[PDB]
Design a binder for this molecule. Structure first.
Ligand code: NAD
Ligand code: NAD
Ligand code: NA
Ligand code: NA
Lengths: 339, 339
């Protein structure tokens, strides 16, 4: 209809969600909030991107508002969610892309002056429900006031896992994501914030860096029958964007590799994963997915079967752009369902 | 009692095999052949290294010979192996590290004028026997005139595979190696030599690049009971050296993770894999293994078990330095057994 969107935290995800939203005819961005940047600064970070190129349209400001392609967007600079007048901007759905309000109690604070619902741009730290478009978004209810769009990796893996589990049955699986660098990593060796994850504090540009991830386990929440049947981990490597899922799983039913390819192709061509999952049989590398909108691109030639029940599947994802498009689509999906 | 070594192809492996041979009194490098570098250029490439630091010692040349650590080394610049006078230079064992002579018929060209044996610094294209020190080098026979030291990845995987297979049994496994950049890759997008590996010719510094590899299947040759039970693939990523094995396997006997750790520690501490396999429980990243001599360093904290028979195990390797040490160790072992 028109999804009336607001964005909290104008970072990689906030700015790309903004761009995706601007591209859609059925979503409008009515407000932005980020206290670590002025208007001139926002204009700059929106104009230029080291990965996704120049903003496709003129960006400026006037009378305290951001002006993008003729449209005015209201701007706030509040540290604390409760102090953001979203209702006065007419915002309904909030993209919560700061990375630090990942509980219901915290995200709730956005909803006391007129806004309707919050979509977390990360997996929740509590039992907030996660949705992955094309996999379980039909489970959303209009009483789900706070929701999460999961992670980039979960959006890559869940669609592939659904197809394989539905057609052949996954007995058990272990996942690795070889993942692009992110904002929480450091340029040179130093202390990670909170002292959480020491490996993340080591020079990003010159290291392969192991990392924990709940993303495969999270597929167990998206696809309940796989709870306890999937987990995994990550290696962070020196590229600025684009990642790849490497899923090793045992199948319940024997398959030729061509049967798995056909099932993916079928899911990509029509039904709920059209525009979500895709495939390639070409000799692709990660830069080939810069600014690719899909959640998951199955790499036909990269995968390998040991035998007819034990297989290693490969699927690409632009962790930044794919995820940001899914989040906007989830916001729009909720807006339609809510009436 | 000295292994008289020659080096064909003075590359990453050639020059590091040279360093390793210089750190032991029971191996001498008597001659080097590389037709793509003058004597002056050889001195330069040996002096300086982007990953392993300056050569530790004076390098010069005099009367047509490379002069290192007081010793004189004979230098040739021949493209055709049959033109290299190994015999006259006093060479017995040849480190064949050019990348292009990986069949018996081709490697035999080194043995026409007085040399005894050739060691391929890569897996062969034919049925040439492969050996991994600490795993199956005792299968070596003095009649094996042409042999291979396998690959860096096989040297990292085989020791780990042996330990897990002997202690718990490997029903099946699939391996990924996240691998440092190599000389066969290109700096910017272009055509790979022979038009073979298209992905490998894509800009190395800005891509995660899938690659095929027989390194896991080769473990089935090193450890015959695992023939047909292991394979895998690789992703080449933008680091200059150091790689890591990610092995997903199904065990025959149930195990707690601590049992796998204990098994690896025992093998690292005494017996045939002392000096071959090691372990860490620290928050390491790839650069911590630059100039690490081990074939395989088990990363205790990076591993993850889904359940008591399905596990993902992680092991680091300095693909240049670990491998180069193993090759020299293999050449020496051969010289001793040959008498
Ligand atoms: N590939 C990806 O980059 C990716 C994919 C999926 C999910 N995510 C998740 O999305 C979230 C944001 O990630 P990102 O990559 O955009 O990080 P980022 O560092 O680029 O964005 C963070 C932004 O939030 C702003 N911010 C900080 N405190 C704020 C506050 N109190 N109020 C309002 N704004 C505030 C910062 O100024 C910054 O602009 C994280 O939870 C991350 O894990 C990232
Ligand atoms: N991580 C590694 O670099 C690594 C690890 C294990 C095995 N290997 C294998 O070892 C071999 C060498 O690898 P590298 O990384 O040292 O490659 P490299 O390109 O650094 O070295 C190859 C050298 O051989 C020389 N050469 C080319 N043609 C020759 C000829 N006709 N006669 C003599 N020399 C010639 C080149 O000038 C070059 O110096 C390859 O088979 C490779 O797969 C490499
Ligand atoms: Na729009
Ligand atoms: Na020596």
């Amino acid at each position: 209809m028109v999804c009336k969107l607001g964005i909290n935290g104008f970072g990689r995800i906030g700015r790309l969600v903004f761009r995706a939203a601007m591209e859609r005819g059925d979503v409008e961005v009515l407000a932005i909030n980020d206290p670590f940047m002025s208007l001139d600064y926002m204009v700059y970070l929106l104009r230029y991107d080291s990965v996704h190129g120049h903003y496709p349209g003129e960006v400026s400001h006037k009378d305290g508002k951001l002006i993008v392609g003729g449209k005015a967007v209201t701007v706030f600079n509040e540290k604390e969610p409760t102090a953001i007048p979203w209702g006065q901007a007419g915002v309904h759905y909030i993209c919560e892309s700061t990375g630090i309000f990942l509980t219901k109690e915290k995200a709730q604070a956005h909803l006391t002056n007129g806004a309707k619902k919050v979509i977390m741009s990360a997996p929740p730290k509590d039992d907030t429900p996660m949705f992955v478009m094309g996999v379980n978004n039909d489970q959303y209810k209009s009483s789900d006031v706070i929701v999460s769009n999961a992670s980039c990796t979960t959006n890559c893996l869940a669609p592939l896992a659904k197809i394989v589990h539905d057609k052949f049955g996954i007995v058990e699986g272990l996942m690795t994501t070889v993942h692009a660098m992110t904002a929480n990593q450091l340029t040179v060796d130093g202390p990670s914030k909170g002292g959480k994850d020491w490996r993340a504090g080591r020079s990003a540009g010159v290291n392969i860096i192991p990392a924990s991830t709940g993303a495969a386990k999270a597929v167990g929440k998206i696809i309940p029958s796989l709870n306890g049947k999937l987990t995994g981990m990550a290696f962070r490597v020196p590229v600025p964007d684009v990642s790849v899922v490497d899923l090793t799983c045992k199948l319940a039913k024997p398959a030729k590799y061509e049967d798995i390819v056909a099932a993916v192709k079928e899911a990509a061509t029509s039904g709920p994963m059209k525009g979500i999952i895709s495939y390639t049989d070409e000799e692709v590398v990660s830069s080939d997915f810069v600014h690719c909108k899909f959640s998951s691109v199955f790499d036909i030639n990269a995968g390998i079967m040991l035998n007819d029940t034990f297989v290693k599947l490969v699927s690409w994802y632009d962790n930044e752009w794919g995820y940001s498009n899914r989040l906007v689509e989830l916001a729009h999906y909720m807006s339609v369902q809510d009436g």
